[PDB]
Design a protein around this ligand. Structure first.
Ligand SMILES: NC(=O)c1ccc[n+]([C@@H]2O[C@H](COP(=O)([O-])OP(=O)(O)OC[C@H]3O[C@@H](n4cnc5c(N)ncnc54)[C@H](OP(=O)(O)O)[C@@H]3O)[C@@H](O)[C@H]2O)c1
Ligand SMILES: NC(=O)c1ccc[n+]([C@@H]2O[C@H](COP(=O)([O-])OP(=O)(O)OC[C@H]3O[C@@H](n4cnc5c(N)ncnc54)[C@H](OP(=O)(O)O)[C@@H]3O)[C@@H](O)[C@H]2O)c1
Ligand SMILES: NC(=O)c1ccc[n+]([C@@H]2O[C@H](COP(=O)([O-])OP(=O)(O)OC[C@H]3O[C@@H](n4cnc5c(N)ncnc54)[C@H](OP(=O)(O)O)[C@@H]3O)[C@@H](O)[C@H]2O)c1
Ligand SMILES: NC(=O)c1ccc[n+]([C@@H]2O[C@H](COP(=O)([O-])OP(=O)(O)OC[C@H]3O[C@@H](n4cnc5c(N)ncnc54)[C@H](OP(=O)(O)O)[C@@H]3O)[C@@H](O)[C@H]2O)c1
Ligand SMILES: C[C@H](CCC(=O)NCCS(=O)(=O)O)[C@H]1CC[C@H]2[C@@H]3[C@H](O)C[C@@H]4C[C@H](O)CC[C@]4(C)[C@H]3CC[C@]12C
Ligand SMILES: C[C@H](CCC(=O)NCCS(=O)(=O)O)[C@H]1CC[C@H]2[C@@H]3[C@H](O)C[C@@H]4C[C@H](O)CC[C@]4(C)[C@H]3CC[C@]12C
Ligand SMILES: C[C@H](CCC(=O)NCCS(=O)(=O)O)[C@H]1CC[C@H]2[C@@H]3[C@H](O)C[C@@H]4C[C@H](O)CC[C@]4(C)[C@H]3CC[C@]12C
Ligand SMILES: C[C@H](CCC(=O)NCCS(=O)(=O)O)[C@H]1CC[C@H]2[C@@H]3[C@H](O)C[C@@H]4C[C@H](O)CC[C@]4(C)[C@H]3CC[C@]12C
Lengths: 261, 261, 261, 261
């Protein structure tokens, strides 16, 4: 199996994209750390992964306590003696306050900007020395299709994720000599709790209509890209901006009227 | 496994990237047609794929006989009743005549332009209806990193492969409703006959100095991307321009100077 | 007068963008050759330009007679002793035969591909040695927003214009040392004969709904960019892909729905 | 009649370099230019010089370290002149001692730089927009850097933050197009100003120059000329552009300096 003997860390992995990513890595033989705030929920995912024949473990991560970005990484390295894979999946925004430039909350914009960007910067920074020691690694950053598709709202989300794509590419260039790769996966609309709970039915219905492949995404879709980038199957690939959004915003905005679902 | 029950076609697949891609697909259970100009050589590859537990077959294709792009597709569709996957791998240039704008041959430029672009247009056009009939398909076009990195020579190669990238995305948009996906894989310097026999040691040594991940690629690196795009593992991904070039041209041209290999 | 003493050639310049580009360059003191197929119409424009206080001349050009791309450049250099500016404005498609991949006419796809691409390659190739001689020049290629926005019809147009974008950037890299710059201007919907007579009222109204700046473009909008790139105001600018389409396809395809006109 | 007769512009950090050159170009075309600057003494010298060149400029206090001045400087201009038409956001920088790669760079300073640079667009754009809406439109021109689209091996906070400004530019562009407010980014390469000359070594600057195809160091006027285009109605149908002014730096293959010394 592809990741036999490798150690991976996935943040925010007790549900949705994070959990699917952890499951996919564990199926291919990685020892997967669920870096998550809830040990009780993590233990359920772990038992489920073990049932499928894989090994996963828990390490505490809370985005509200930024120190845990580094401590999570150091705990894993101490316990396993190596770190091979890091998947940075934490991210979000405040739909109540993250609007357009003028209507959005100024302070919250900069809170969101730092919160998302640091969720890549801090753990990547801590993990790199351990990855260097074992002769390489892969860092996979979950961005969003909004990072390359300017919008009319959620400006802090869009800009901060675009910043993550940039940071991905700079990290990739800076540690290529150490065989450390860095790539970004940009999901579109995926049928997780986050989208279903924060975006109204009419928003998601409108959005779906502009998705050429004509369905809502699954967490597995994202996980499968994460697996590609995590493994040596993408060993010659670094700095990629990888779109997993059913072709959303690929072409003309006339698409939905001329190709109606 | 991931491609059990599927029928694939790979053009120019008796060696190098084409062969490796055919091998990777067959290993995952696809029935792979080697669309190639030499039946004798195809029979060798077929015998080896069979040794490995896979099934491959031969269909006649020569880029010099443009009719064969369509006939090979019709032959496969008739023989197997379906086509699921098309990998368009044929491509190239004339190093004697394809130079910069002014020094390169005018007529050859346009010959190359049509030669490369039709190698995607013609077989994709014939394949589509067969793909529609089985509820979808995947078309993977082998471009080159040169398609997004302007150069000081091989202008026809660069321009024609850029055209392919555009063609890839238009096809992707146009057949997404039929669950037909189209993605491009752009190799950098790969250790095949084409690069090793047409480019000098000194050119390839220079090129390698600017490759962040600091090695020549393998046909397997490309085949691994083809596999991703050919399978349902990339079912929500279409219109991608996928760079497999070791990070070549990702960032500053000062790179080799400050990070000397 | 920014262009005093300079010699410019604008193809297909008896109406629309070509004309407006010729007029703008002439107003800034350039001697402007109308490379056109109708001498009679060209003489009307020259007259109008003369009344405005500028100088323009005629040189025969017809895209159906490809030798004229070269002959018209040599005539101009012979008559004036120099060439400074080249605006490649010719281009188009056949709306009856240029559809999607499968419904479009195969042979006409490759005719349009050559026709459009050669409308840049041939005259630029001819002009470069003359620009070299006077210590530099500017080549401005008229592309289209369609070159960076995949569509569901006019596939030959989209791909061929994308090819021109790549050709532009390769030329730019290749002749920078000679101070010969090359940039591309990409118009959106412009109120000229070509759009009004070839596209339906329904199509053009739909398109306009997706233009954030909420008006149809004018030939003058494109001429103004052409002037920028033609002069030393852009002396440190080469290889640009310059969008003049009122924001069309800048951002989310939900735009029209939430921000309707 | 001058192009910007009766318009009011604001240029931040405009007592020298790019900012001064931009102010000068706008004033030369008839705009009333406010120098939003930290030193009234120096601003008065620039004002006197602009006056001699035949233009009109004024002072308004702005210091990046006093973030409330982003807003008060805007309000002051609107109160004094009853309108705002043009905003040029030119303040930006980094700390070369602390802004290194991911691992060697200072964590806290990375996020300080990120907020400093991004807020230098966010805050004053947000304050100016309502005034621009009131006069029927406006143009916001953000001074980025070529580094925003060219990943590097140092100055990661500078690269990432400026990339974020590009994204912010495009979201602003989309969001206020319906108010005829345009937003575009100009990306300077190596310009002969105090900041590049004092903070970068001769060795770095010389190496950089070897990779500039147009083969000279840029001038402040080159940036100013682009600013003038975007600020004026000559670009009235242009919004969301990322405009490169770097003599072709990083346009193409990193082998360029080798083969085109
Ligand atoms: N829903 C979508 O359409 C979608 C699609 C693609 C990507 N994304 C992005 O991908 C990522 C995954 O989101 P998702 O869609 O999969 O949503 P999800 O199903 O609700 O999962 C959210 C995960 O994030 C964890 N989390 C939330 N706050 C946390 C905090 N302070 N500290 C540590 N962990 C925290 C949650 O832990 P608990 O289980 O304890 O709550 C949970 O595991 C996000 O970055 C998002 O930007 C969203
Ligand atoms: N090597 C690289 O660095 C690299 C990088 C990027 C992209 N690519 C692209 O990958 C593709 C394959 O290149 P490669 O490196 O794998 O070269 P390769 O190992 O030399 O293989 C070339 C293949 O193309 C076949 N071929 C040549 N002319 C043909 C014709 N008229 N009709 C049918 N088949 C023909 C050959 O058939 P025979 O066996 O009978 O000779 C052979 O199978 C090309 O599109 C190339 O542009 C290569
Ligand atoms: N309409 C649009 O929305 C639009 C907008 C921007 C760019 N474009 C592109 O910009 C360019 C000009 O388009 P336009 O809109 O300005 O069209 P236009 O106003 O209709 O004028 C088209 C020009 O092309 C000339 N022409 C047609 N066939 C020719 C041939 N065989 N040989 C020489 N000249 C020929 C015409 O000459 P005659 O006067 O003799 O007929 C005319 O001068 C094209 O490259 C087009 O792709 C179109
Ligand atoms: N390659 C290059 O040449 C280059 C160099 C630097 C920056 N840039 C980029 O272009 C822009 C301008 O730089 P430049 O080249 O023109 O450098 P410059 O000649 O050194 O000018 C920098 C300007 O910024 C002002 N400034 C510095 N800190 C300030 C603060 N806290 N508050 C208000 N104003 C402040 C300075 O005011 P004082 O006059 O009072 O000192 C000065 O006018 C920046 O956004 C940067 O991204 C390019
Ligand atoms: C609002 C969601 C984040 C939720 C979040 O921050 N978590 C809660 C934590 S907190 O209570 O706010 O602190 C985000 C995560 C994924 C986002 C979506 C995806 O990125 C894909 C889509 C991208 C588009 O640009 C916008 C719609 C689109 C469909 C996004 C809408 C908002 C989503 C659903
Ligand atoms: C010259 C080669 C094609 C050979 C060919 O077409 N043979 C038959 C034509 S003929 O017998 O000479 O007529 C091509 C195949 C792949 C090309 C390379 C790859 O695409 C990757 C690299 C891309 C860069 O832009 C240029 C260098 C780079 C390394 C390319 C140089 C030329 C190569 C090696
Ligand atoms: C159909 C037009 C070509 C006409 C032409 O070449 N005529 C002579 C040839 S023929 O007689 O018909 O053979 C072209 C020229 C400019 C094109 C438009 C512009 O490029 C801008 C737009 C580009 C988009 O991708 C599609 C719509 C969009 C609005 C285009 C539709 C078709 C246009 C209007
Ligand atoms: C270091 C410079 C800013 C200085 C500054 O902020 N000073 C005050 C801060 S502190 O006192 O040092 O903390 C910046 C301004 C412009 C930058 C340059 C330009 O953006 C253009 C170039 C962009 C490339 O990515 C890197 C080199 C390149 C040539 C840059 C080097 C660093 C420069 C010169």
């Amino acid at each position: 199996k592809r990741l036999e003997g490798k150690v991976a860390i996935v943040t925010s992995s007790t549900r949705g994209i994070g959990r699917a990513s952890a499951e996919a890595l564990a199926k291919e033989g990685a020892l997967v750390y669920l870096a998550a705030r809830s040990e009780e929920l993590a233990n359920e995912v772990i038992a489920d992964i073990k049932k499928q024949g894989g090994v996963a473990k828990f390490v505490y991560f809370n985005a509200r306590e930024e120190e845990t970005y580094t401590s999570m990484v150091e705990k894993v390295a101490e316990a396993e003696g190596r770190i091979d894979i890091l998947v940075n999946n934490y991210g979000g925004t405040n739909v109540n306050l993250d609007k357009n430039l003028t209507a959005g909350d100024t302070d919250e914009f900069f809170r969101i900007l730092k919160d998302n960007v640091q969720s890549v910067y801090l753990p990547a920074k801590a993990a790199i020395p351990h990855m260097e020691k074992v002769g390489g690694g892969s860092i996979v950053n979950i961005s969003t299709i909004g990072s390359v598709v300017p919008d009319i709202s959620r400006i802090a989300y869009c800009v901060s994720k675009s910043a993550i794509n940039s940071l991905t590419q700079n990290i990739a260039l800076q540690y290529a000599r150490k065989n450390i790769r860095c790539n970004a996966v940009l999901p579109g609309l995926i049928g997780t709790r986050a989208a279903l709970e924060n975006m109204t039915d009419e928003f998601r219905d409108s959005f779906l209509g502009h998705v050429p492949l004509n369905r809502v995404g699954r967490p597995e879709d994202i996980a499968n890209a994460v697996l590609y980038y995590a493994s040596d199957d993408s060993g010659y690939v670094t700095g990629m901006i990888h779109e997993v959004a059913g072709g959303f915003a690929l072409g003309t905005p006339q698409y939905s009227e001329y190709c109606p679902r």
